[PDB]
């Protein structure tokens, strides 16, 4: 019940804030591969060994984390969480590498798979930093989440992030719909690829 | 000093049961809730239930009661979690985290180093299905365990060839594409894509072309 943004990003010394839209507030930062940790508890008191440029607030429904000058630590995963809800998600980057737009290309499914009254949409996204996406499915304009399976980003060979995303289809709903799109999200910044059946 | 030390990784089938420990010291064991929360690869957090060291009451969340059960050991200090019915959706790793306080039962102020379950079933064969263009790959679809070696033309061409990471789906196979990018010469040059997956003994070669 917790919405909070997937991407979120700044140069050593910016400061970034995360949304947390949903009693008191509690924020959690979590590197990879590793336990999460409490940094912020009751809407924006901090814990001992949390620097004092991590600081929160809550003004409405919404509650909001903000992390002043950034440092290398700072880019991992922070959730807010209420009570036993848990948030979405949001990565936090440090910009270590100069910025890079994703590069998108989507697949229809094949001549072959139709065959097997099978279909798979293969959309494909490397060389973009920072490593988070925003991928959601559009059939004929209307966001489908039913038999979409998204991976994460993960460290290519020059630094930078690739994931895959698939919208499992069966050919009865992959002709009915006009056309069905792979839009991605950057930090604001959409990319839409459409394909069309024949 | 407060620790909380859980047991190894395991490894179950569909349907088999796991349980994991979380040894307990240097803080009043029945004075604090402990709770335990899944977090599945690249998901977020999930709360599944907490119970009182003191009188072993326990309140399981909604999506996992009659699935779960939580107990407590005062001797050894040590909290207990055993789920069953378990599913290929279930592979997540598991921490026992403690309640700060009597007043504050929900920021976990101390965590533990996790325990990854796997939960293991169906190999199978993979399916490959061409991509046609520009550019051109092959779809590996509903394979299992990892990893799966893709090559093209055998080995005949290195550049351009992006071997994404693997989906977990639903089901519990894994889905890889790779990819090639071509000047588009479509017509001249002839691409094969060579998938070959030891644990099942499975090697298909199959022509891409528009």
């Known amino acids: 019940a917790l919405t909070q943004p997937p991407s979120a990003s700044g140069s050593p010394g910016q400061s970034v804030t995360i949304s947390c839209t949903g009693?008191?507030v509690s924020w959690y930062q979590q590197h990879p591969g590793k336990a999460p940790k409490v940094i912020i508890y009751?809407?924006?008191k901090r814990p001992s060994g949390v620097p004092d440029r991590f600081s929160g607030s809550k003004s409405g429904n919404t509650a909001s984390l903000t992390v002043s000058g950034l440092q290398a630590d700072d880019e991992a995963d922070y959730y807010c969480?209420?009570?036993?809800?848990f948030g979405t998600g949001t990565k936090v980057t440090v910009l270590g590498q100069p910025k890079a737009a994703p590069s998108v290309t989507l697949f229809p499914p094949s001549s072959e798979e139709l065959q097997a009254n099978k279909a798979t949409l293969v959309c494909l996204i490397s060389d973009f930093y920072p490593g988070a996406v925003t991928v959601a499915w559009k059939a004929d304009s209307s966001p489908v989440k039913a038999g979409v399976e998204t991976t994460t980003p993960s460290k290519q060979s020059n630094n930078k992030y690739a994931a895959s995303s698939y919208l499992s289809l069966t050919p009865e709903q992959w002709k009915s719909h006009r056309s069905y799109s792979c839009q991605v999200t950057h930090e604001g910044s959409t990319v839409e690829k459409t394909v069309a059946p024949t | 000093q407060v620790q909380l030390v859980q047991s190894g990784a395991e490894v179950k089938k569909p349907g088999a049961s796991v349980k994991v420990s979380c040894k307990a010291s240097?803080?009043?064991?029945?004075?604090?809730?402990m709770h335990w929360v899944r977090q599945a690869p690249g998901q977020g957090l999930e709360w599944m239930g907490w119970?009182?060291?003191?009188?072993?009451?326990?309140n399981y969340a909604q999506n996992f009661q009659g699935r779960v059960t939580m107990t407590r050991d005062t001797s050894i200090t040590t909290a207990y979690m055993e789920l069953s019915r378990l599913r290929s959706d279930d592979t997540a790793v598991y921490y026992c985290?403690?309640?700060?306080?009597?007043?504050?039962?929900?920021?976990?102020?101390?965590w533990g180093q996790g325990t990854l379950v796997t939960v293991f079933n169906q190999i199978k064969g993979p399916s490959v299905f061409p991509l046609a263009p520009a550019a051109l790959g092959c779809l590996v679809k509903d394979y299992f365990p990892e990893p799966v070696t893709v090559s093209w033309n055998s080995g005949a061409l290195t550049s351009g060839v992006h071997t994404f990471p693997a989906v977990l789906q639903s089901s519990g196979l894994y889905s890889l594409s790779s990819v090639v990018t071509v000047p588009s010469s479509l017509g001249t040059q002839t691409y094969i894509c060579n998938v070959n997956h030891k644990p099942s003994n499975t090697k298909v070669d199959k022509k891409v072309e528009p």
């Open positions: 985290a403690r309640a700060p306080d009597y007043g504050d039962r929900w920021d976990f102020d101390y």
């Open positions: 240097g803080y009043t064991f029945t004075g604090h809730y």
């Open positions: 119970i009182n060291p003191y009188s072993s009451g326990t």
């Open positions: 009693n008191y």
């Open positions: 009751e809407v924006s």
């Open positions: 969480s209420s009570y036993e809800v």
